[PDB]
Amino acid sequence: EVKLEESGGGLVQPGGSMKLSCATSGFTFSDAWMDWVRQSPEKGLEWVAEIRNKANNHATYYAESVKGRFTISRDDSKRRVYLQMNTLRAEDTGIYYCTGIYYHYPWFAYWGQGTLVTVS
């Protein structure tokens, strides 16, 4: 079974910072391009960040709205992907999901349960 679980969400002041973690199993992590998508109470579901596999230099790509403030990273040894958020805005409030691109379904086919980030 493909399994993903996010943690780290919570209430935070504007301008503050918060790191999310995502633990995974049930697929080859080192092959997977990994992503964060958020469900905003203002914008709905919206892709946030992607980090590629080692063979593509673990290259990172961000939504314009979070570029320069958010940092997506991965640990292939732990099969975990992270999202470090800085200088948070009210706009960043929402449910944050980790997901990725899978061999049999090369799009966001499986998602974690989501972790709620609330900017006060």
């Binding site: 579901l45 086919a109 349960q113």
Partner: protein, 113 residues
Amino acid sequence: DVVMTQTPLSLPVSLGNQASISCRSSQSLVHSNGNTYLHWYLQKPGQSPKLLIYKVSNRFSGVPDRFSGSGSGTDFTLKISRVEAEDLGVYFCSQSTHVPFTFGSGTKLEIKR
């Protein structure tokens, strides 16, 4: 980014009735490999969106044949035949032909009496 728009926001239906959701993309979802990556997710309260229909018309694992997806290019439809209480939730169309992947605003299926 490719803008996905779907109507209605809320879709009241009677049990046993047919429901149809419209989804439009701001540009063609035909990929260069000739396939069309329009998908539908269903979300229940407090849970993550679950893949329901993928690539226009393919039912994901465990999805009843009462769900049938249709359409082409920029214009798509999800038809839910003989609606049951299990079908309740918010349906999202989504495209993964173009990077970044994007999502419609959602349609809440609900039972009206």
